[PDB]
Design a protein around this ligand. Structure first.
Ligand SMILES: CCCCCCCCCCCCCCCC(=O)O
Ligand SMILES: CCCCCCCCCCCCCCCC(=O)O
Length: 155
């Protein structure tokens, strides 16, 4: 059973507050249902994974759906470069998440390595790409721009 404390506090500080509060709120039952849905995967896409979740839990399914629709609409407003970055960042974050469901949770060095890559991809974008991303994701843009992500990653 995954516990919120399993994630280092300084990595949780890099996550947007809505994502942090979603995870912090999880009951023991919520975590069982998330793990069972993940284990009954893989799925065609995120939407199919959420539909399977809603079947087990209309309430947790609706909570996940609300977060997902907000992220999906923010990505839809991006130009091709910032969309590519956001989608690659999500793929990296999902691989980290997969490790908390399956055996052997990521180490702090594994998390530092994932942030280091996401930051590198952020820095690889043009200024127009960074500005486009920042308009939709101001918390994450600030984590990158302030040096907060670099401090965690170690560099
Ligand atoms: C990241 C916001 C939550 C998104 C919806 C799925 C939540 C269930 C995940 C449980 C395992 C915790 C994973 C922590 C690492 C990470 O979120 O990147
Ligand atoms: C069952 C938990 C999964 C919910 C994850 C919600 C937070 C991440 C949102 C990013 C969506 C990316 C676009 C959809 C791509 C796809 O369907 O493969």
């Amino acid at each position: 059973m995954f516990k919120y404390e399993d994630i280092p506090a300084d990595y949780r500080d890099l996550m947007p507050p809505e994502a942090r509060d979603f995870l912090q709120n999880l009951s023991d039952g919520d975590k069982t249902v998330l793990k069972e849905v993940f284990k009954a995967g893989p799925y065609k896409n995120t939407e199919e994974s959420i539909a399977a979740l809603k079947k087990k839990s209309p309430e947790l399914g609706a909570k996940v759906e609300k977060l997902h629709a907000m992220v999906k609409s923010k990505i839809a407003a991006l130009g091709p470069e910032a969309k590519g970055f956001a989608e690659k960042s999500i793929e990296i974050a999902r691989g980290i998440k997969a490790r908390y469901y399956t055996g052997n949770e990521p180490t702090k060095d594994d998390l530092k390595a994932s942030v280091k890559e996401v930051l590198k991809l952020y820095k690889a974008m043009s200024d127009a790409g960074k500005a486009d991303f920042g308009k939709q994701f101001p918390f994450l843009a600030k984590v990158f721009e302030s040096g907060k992500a670099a401090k965690f990653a170690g560099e």
